[PDB]
């Protein structure tokens, strides 16, 4: 289990993208934009 | 303007068809059994084409 104090002090954020099977992932790009 | 015009040889061969159809219809309206009018109209539309 991750430390709750660590979760409180950290600033790193996460998300995810699930490419559904059969969707050609070469045609899929994931990341951040401004 | 969509495209697909007749070729030069197409035009040549159409004109040759015209000439030979005129030769065919020349002095043969009596030989044609009242279809001479049909050939007349044929050569007509050929002339406008």
């Amino acid at each position: 289990r991750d430390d709750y104090d660590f979760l409180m002090q950290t600033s790193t954020y996460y998300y995810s993208v699930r490419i559904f099977p059969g969707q050609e992932p070469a045609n899929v790009w994931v990341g951040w934009i401004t | 303007c969509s495209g697909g015009h007749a070729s030069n040889k197409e035009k040549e061969m159409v004109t040759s068809l015209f000439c030979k159809l005129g030769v065919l219809v020349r002095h043969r309206i009596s030989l044609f059994g009242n279809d001479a009018t049909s050939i007349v109209n044929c050569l007509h539309i050929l002339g406008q084409t």
Partner: protein
């Protein structure tokens, strides 16, 4: 590994270090080589560019992993200390047009 999208849906996880500006990506539980470094005060929008080759294209998951606080905490100021992932109505997909 190859054919990761075949057996199961492929999962790309994007982690951003707002304190240092490091952007890293983890696919199938291992951190990919490509990483980015952004200058301070940058606003980064989660984004996916996809050419649909299937009726179902993809899925944004707003979950969280070990030692990383979920995206809603970063987005909303009220939930800055809420470990529970959230998808409030303000968050929504926008497409370029």
């Amino acid at each position: 590994p190859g054919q990761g999208r075949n057996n199961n849906g492929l999962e790309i996880g994007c982690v951003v270090d707002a304190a240092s500006g490091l952007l890293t990506f983890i696919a199938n539980g291992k951190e990919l080589s490509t990483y980015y470094q952004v200058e301070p005060s940058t606003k980064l929008f989660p984004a996916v560019f996809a050419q649909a080759t299937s009726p179902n294209v993809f899925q944004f998951e707003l979950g969280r992993i070990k030692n990383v606080m979920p995206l809603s905490a970063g987005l909303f100021k009220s939930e800055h200390k809420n470990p529970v992932p959230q998808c409030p109505p303000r968050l929504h997909v926008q497409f370029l047009s």
